[PDB]
Design a protein around this ligand. Structure first.
Ligand SMILES: CCC(=O)N(c1ccccc1)C1CCN(CCc2ccccc2)CC1
Lengths: 212, 216
């Protein structure tokens, strides 16, 4: 089969700049090459066909070039909503084959996390479990740590963390941390705290509640 | 405009088979190739093959011969992909897709993707819990979607009319069950005064649940 190679799995740019994603075919595929965009949780969307023609409704900031084996997707005046994975593909010969993808990352200014903590709902407690949730939202850059304390003591087991990709509107990151306890364990303690450490503050950014 | 409707999920046991449907509307079904694509979680794209509904001409990726079978039913404008002898390597999202021409450009359409999970586990619907601030300019609310199987779940707020300021987190698998959460941030003048509701769909269990966030 024809191998399509994208040798930059990640490329970093800034809003308003120009970025070029490269793609190399192992053998001549003429101009029978397409480009696709894929954002998290979504199907792929075609950008370019015949190596240089834009699909309907695709902004003219997207341009394609190349013939033979070297192909380029160029994005001019990069917008925050261009945050996505980009795939090249040849349909010259069976089987049609895709490049490995290139993820676009957008540089922006530092942003401190907005922290919110939530107690277990009465709905969850009615069946014997108890999750405490902490959202650490809209921060930049991506590096961040979260620490849970129960009545002042650090709690490590029972914590599950999840992170979003960069937001399509403001290019920040967010994170969700969930501390799951039993209802019985939860009701033995009063103070519940989640602490974020991020480069935007030399102290932890903290949120708490008392079960009172 | 054109819709390709695929079921959200299929849970099938190892060794069995599955037939994924792609119901098309908005164009002449028998005029266009219908393509099928496989995508494994966090991985790239694989072309399975294509079928032309006129006479069911097919072109297959050789790697899927004996695994995938493409057919069509012109009476219902539906395309099908059958997968035999399922293994965990078959677990993936499967898309159908076509394109037609308008003005001076092609325009593509895709199904939402069918998440096939190959597993002997049972379906388990999620429990949906409201996240309200215990007793500022902006207020953050959320929805905890806990203990479901298999993937996916989709989350909206106010039936989709609340789309700014939402973060919906990837699920995490623990003790054979998935859990995810979604947060939404709104002006403090609009909530509690106006209602905020998370809508949670788990296609594998045919569940759609609404949870109103009411203040504590
Ligand atoms: C992954 C599936 C796939 O490979 N495709 C696709 C993508 C989206 C929706 C339907 C199918 C191809 C996209 C490019 N087209 C080119 C058409 C063409 C041919 C000759 C001259 C001008 C244009 C071929 C099919």
């Amino acid at each position: 089969d024809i191998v399509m190679t994208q040798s930059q799995k990640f490329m970093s740019t800034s809003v308003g700049d120009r970025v070029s994603v490269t793609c190399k075919a192992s053998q001549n595929v003429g101009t029978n090459v397409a480009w696709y965009q894929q954002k998290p949780g979504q199907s792929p969307k075609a950008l370019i066909y015949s190596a240089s023609y834009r699909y309907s409704g695709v902004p003219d900031r997207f341009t394609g070039s190349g013939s033979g084996t070297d192909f380029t997707l160029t994005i001019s005046n990069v917008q925050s909503e261009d945050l996505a994975e980009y795939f090249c593909q040849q349909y010259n010969t069976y089987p049609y084959t895709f490049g490995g993808g290139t993820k676009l990352e957008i540089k922006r200014a530092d942003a401190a996390p907005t922290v919110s903590i939530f107690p277990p709902s009465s709905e969850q407690l009615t069946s014997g479990g108890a999750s405490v949730v902490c959202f650490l939202n809209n921060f930049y850059p991506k590096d961040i740590n979260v620490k849970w304390k129960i009545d002042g003591s650090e709690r490590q087991n029972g914590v599950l963390n999840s992170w979003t990709d960069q937001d399509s509107k403001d290019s920040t990151y967010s994170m969700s941390s969930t501390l799951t306890l039993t209802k019985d364990e939860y009701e033995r303690h009063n103070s519940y705290t989640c602490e974020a450490t991020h480069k935007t503050s030399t102290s932890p950014i903290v949120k708490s509640f008392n079960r009172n | 405009q054109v819709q390709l409707q695929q079921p959200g999920a299929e849970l099938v046991k190892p060794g069995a088979s599955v037939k994924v449907s792609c119901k098309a509307s908005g164009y002449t079904f028998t005029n266009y190739w219908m393509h099928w694509v496989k995508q494994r979680p966090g991985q790239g794209l694989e072309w399975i093959g294509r079928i032309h509904p006129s006479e069911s001409d097919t072109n297959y990726n050789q790697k899927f011969k004996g695994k995938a079978t493409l057919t069509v039913d012109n009476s219902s404008s539906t395309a099908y992909m059958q997968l035999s002898s399922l293994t965990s390597e078959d677990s993936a999202v499967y898309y159908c897709a076509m394109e037609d021409y308008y003005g001076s450009s092609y325009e593509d359409y895709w199904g939402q993707g069918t998440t096939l999970t190959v597993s002997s586990a049972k379906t388990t619907p999620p429990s949906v819990y409201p996240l309200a601030p215990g007793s500022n300019s902006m207020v953050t609310l959320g929805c905890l979607v806990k203990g479901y199987f298999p993937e996916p779940v989709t989350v909206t707020w106010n039936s989709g009319s609340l789309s700014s300021g939402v973060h919906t987190f990837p699920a995490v698998l623990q003790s054979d069950l998935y859990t995810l959460s979604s947060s939404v941030t709104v002006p403090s003048s609009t909530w509690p005064s106006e209602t905020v509701t998370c809508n949670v769909a788990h296609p594998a269990s045919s569940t759609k649940v609404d949870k109103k966030i009411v203040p504590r």
